[PDB]
């Protein structure tokens, strides 16, 4: 009777007007605060995803076979059961899953039975008994799993992660204040390319992270790293171009970063670095260097080597003196020096032909020079300056960036 009342309650017109898009650009039905699924869901055959939020003890019929466009499920606190032919259809059709488990039962054991899975988002609250999860160790059934985002307290890395060593390409953990141990599993990653260990309570770089051989993007955000020292073997990560190490407590960058000549994306913002090294600037390949909100005192004049740098965010730092060597590099497109400790702005800025971003908000300045009109790619919306200093500009200089 509950299902009969629900079917009458939720006409197909109501579900059609409920239709919207998700964060993955798919047609998603956000079914929230319900007793079960209506049978009029499957009349919308153009659907590509369902968001089931807090809909427990749900039995999916075989009529899901009408959802030919379906390729994603998002189960939020739902203890859902499925039927055999529906299980086969979603085994032969589904690609993306995202299950949140506030309670253990809300994580279903049926969802690992598929094999066409590519992307998985295992958000929730996992118990510390991680190796006992045979439901986890069923990810070996998935023969195409490439994205694995576990937003849970992953103390010890599962052997489920071992069983998906090759086919995985994106690996994401939000450990939320728990130390990440049992490093041999992350040693067993062979073809993993993106390692996203966000807040794994790593007191330094794990030897497992460094035993990776095919990594391309490493993120150790909110991990209290003490040093970057083992870098004599980062040369084997020639495939690596993205180093994400911001919101951390690193205080220095040694010369060892010269080992990777393919590094492009470098993140060191919100760190404990008090003086930027020159041997960091010795590398010239680096195109993205993020150091916002740091404690940097000054920039050594070796930054002129960094010609390919298209992003040097030194904003909101302690930097009082900016050398003229940085203005020699003309490829710097996104430059933010807002809320810094500077006194005057360098007149020689016109050589930066490709310069879209300039941010100087909060920093103390005496008089804006006319040479701010010398920038070619600068825009008034791109040049974030206060209205009072907007007044302190010549009218032609105003129109130089104001008129498109």
């Amino acid at each position: 009777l509950k299902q009969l009342n629900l079917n009458n309650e939720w006409t197909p017109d109501k579900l059609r007007q409920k239709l919207q898009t998700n964060a993955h650009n798919r047609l998603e039905l956000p079914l929230i605060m319900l007793s079960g699924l209506p049978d009029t869901v499957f009349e919308i055959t153009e659907l590509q995803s369902l968001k089931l939020e807090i809909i427990k003890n749900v039995m999916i019929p075989a009529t899901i076979a009408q959802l030919d466009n379906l390729q994603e499920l998002c189960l939020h606190q739902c203890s859902v059961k499925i039927h055999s032919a529906a299980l086969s259809f979603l085994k032969e059709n589904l690609k993306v899953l995202s299950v949140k488990f506030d309670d253990m039962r809300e994580l279903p054991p049926w969802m690992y039975g598929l094999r066409n899975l590519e992307e998985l988002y295992l958000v929730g609250s996992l118990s510390h008994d991680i190796s006992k999860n045979v439901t986890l160790e069923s990810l070996r059934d998935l023969k195409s799993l490439k994205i694995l985002s576990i937003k849970s307290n992953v103390s010890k890395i599962p052997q489920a992660v071992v069983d998906v060593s090759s086919h995985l390409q994106k690996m994401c953990v939000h450990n939320d204040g728990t130390k990440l141990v049992m490093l041999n599993n992350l040693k067993k990653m062979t073809n993993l390319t993106e390692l996203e260990l966000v807040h794994c309570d790593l007191e330094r770089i794990p030897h497992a992270v460094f035993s990776l051989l095919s990594l391309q993007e490493l993120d150790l955000k909110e991990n209290n790293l003490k040093s970057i020292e083992e870098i004599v073997s980062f040369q084997h990560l020639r495939k690596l171009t993205v180093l994400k190490l911001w919101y951390n407590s690193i205080a220095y960058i040694p010369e060892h970063i010269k080992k990777l000549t393919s590094l492009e994306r470098l993140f060191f913002s919100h760190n404990k670095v008090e003086v930027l090294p020159s041997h960091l600037f010795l590398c010239n390949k680096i195109r993205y260097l993020d150091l916002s909100y740091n404690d940097i005192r000054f920039i050594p004049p070796e930054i002129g080597v960094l010609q390919s740098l298209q992003y040097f965010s030194i904003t909101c730092n302690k930097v009082e003196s900016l050398p003229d060597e940085l203005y020699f590099c003309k490829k710097l497109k996104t430059l933010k020096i807002g809320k810094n400790s500077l006194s005057v702005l360098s007149p020689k800025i016109g050589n930066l032909l490709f310069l879209s971003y300039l941010d100087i908000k909060g920093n103390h300045f005496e008089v804006l020079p006319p040479e701010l009109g010398d920038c070619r790619a600068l825009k008034r919306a791109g040049l974030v300056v206060e209205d009072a200093l907007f007044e302190t500009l010549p009218s032609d200089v105003r129109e130089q960036m104001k008129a498109d």
Binding site: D13, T21, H24, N25, S356, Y357, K379, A381, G382, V384
Partner: protein, 407 residues
């Protein structure tokens, strides 16, 4: 008692709040799973399209004289009996009838007496033993029929439509997986302006479309077209403007499509095409170049020649870098670049003005350039993108775009 009670419960005001609008901007009323049909529905005067779905064995009252704006009778699995004055009224007023049935006896026999009917949608199997097009042999009585949709699993096209197609102007045949033996029988059917052969599993383009001359919108959706080499003869069709060769197995485009200068919308999406020949890029009249969900790895620069292009949808392709010449065409209104492998979007998009909705979510886009805010008509609903990608724009430029969302 039940019919009288249904007349009683379905009050006028609840029908007024039940009124909706269709894709054709006509007032609408969907009657789904009722014992009969309410007389207060028939008391309405502003209603234009009434939708009779799953109505078991009802009779149409003559109170349809009140339904003057009624023009589209939608019959879904409804065995309808008819009163004679209402029959005359529908003969002189009703102009569009859609009939879906599960049994060939479910179709009303008074539909042939209709004379003002032009649009017919016979969805459901007309092909049966001794009822194969003999039931609809009464559409010879229909005179002004111009749209004849047939989702009916037809093994061979009827001789009755060969008799009728002198006045027919659209022939949408959906067999859901049954091949037509056309036998060049459309030569007597000379007045078609649109032909929509969808899900017919033809596996090749028949020569009946080639014998015709008046077609301007040709759709061959899901016909399993592996090769489309015949299109060289399509220059004979001097009036075609929309060659919807989508949802097929097309793996390449022959260069003779360059002879088709009259194309305005070329819907090749969900095909297996991996390279665009430059000869296809000769046609200056292309406006809707949808090549989405295909195997294209690069976009030729000659796209800058296509100045009339408005909506370039290359969604879910292998295009890594957009050439600057893509922004040479200033008429791009909807650049659907989503789900691609675009590494970075060049700043030349700031020159575009007609851009109203650009799709970049699901790409390899590192950051959103500032010049993307230079487009006036672009708004947040138009600029669909990941939130962190939105955050890369300057907060003053982000304020401009958030204001375009607001203002």
């Amino acid at each position: 008692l039940r019919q009288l009670n249904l007349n009683n419960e379905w009050t006028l005001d609840k029908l007024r709040q039940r009124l909706t609008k269709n894709a054709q901007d006509k007032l609408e009323l969907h009657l789904f799973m009722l014992s009969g049909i309410p007389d207060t529905v028939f008391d309405l005067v502003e209603l234009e399209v009434l939708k009779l779905e799953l109505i078991p064995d009802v009779t149409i009252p003559p109170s349809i004289a009140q339904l003057t704006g009624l023009k589209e009778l939608w019959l879904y699995h409804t065995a309808a009996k008819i009163e004679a004055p209402a029959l005359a009224f529908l003969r002189e007023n009703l102009r569009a009838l859609h009939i879906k049935f599960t049994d060939i006896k479910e179709i009303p026999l008074w539909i042939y007496s209709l004379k003002t009917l032009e649009e017919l949608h016979l969805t459901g199997n007309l092909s049966a033993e001794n009822n194969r097009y003999i039931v609809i042999d009464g559409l010879r009585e229909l005179k002004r029929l111009k749209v004849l949709r047939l989702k009916s699993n037809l093994s061979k096209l009827p001789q009755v439509v060969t008799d009728v197609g002198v006045h027919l102007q659209k022939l949408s045949i959906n067999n859901e997986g049954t091949k037509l033996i056309v036998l060049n029988s459309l030569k007597k059917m000379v007045n078609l302006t649109e032909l929509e052969l969808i899900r017919c599993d033809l596996e090749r383009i028949p020569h009946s479309i080639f014998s015709l001359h008046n077609l301007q919108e040709i759709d061959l959706k899901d016909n399993n077209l592996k090769t489309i080499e015949e299109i060289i003869s399509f220059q004979h069709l001097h009036r075609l403007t929309c060659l919807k060769l989508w949802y097929n197995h097309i793996a390449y485009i022959p260069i003779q499509i360059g002879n088709l200068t009259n194309l305005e919308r070329l819907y090749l999406n969900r095909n297996k095409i991996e390279k665009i020949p430059t000869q296809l890029f000769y046609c200056r009249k292309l406006r809707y170049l949808d090549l989405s969900h295909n195997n294209l790895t690069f976009l030729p620069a000659d796209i800058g020649l296509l100045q009339n292009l408005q909506n370039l949808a290359v969604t879910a392709n292998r295009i890594e870098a957009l050439p600057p010449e893509l922004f040479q065409c200033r008429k791009l209104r909807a650049l659907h670049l989503g789900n691609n492998v675009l590494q970075s979007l060049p700043s030349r998009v700031g020159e575009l003005t007609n851009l109203t909705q650009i799709e970049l979510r699901g790409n390899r886009l590192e950051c959103l350039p500032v010049e993307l805010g230079e487009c006036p008509l672009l708004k947040r609903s138009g600029l669909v993108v990941e939130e962190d990608l939105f955050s890369t724009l300057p907060p003053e430029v982000k304020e401009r775009l958030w204001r375009a969302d607001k203002e």
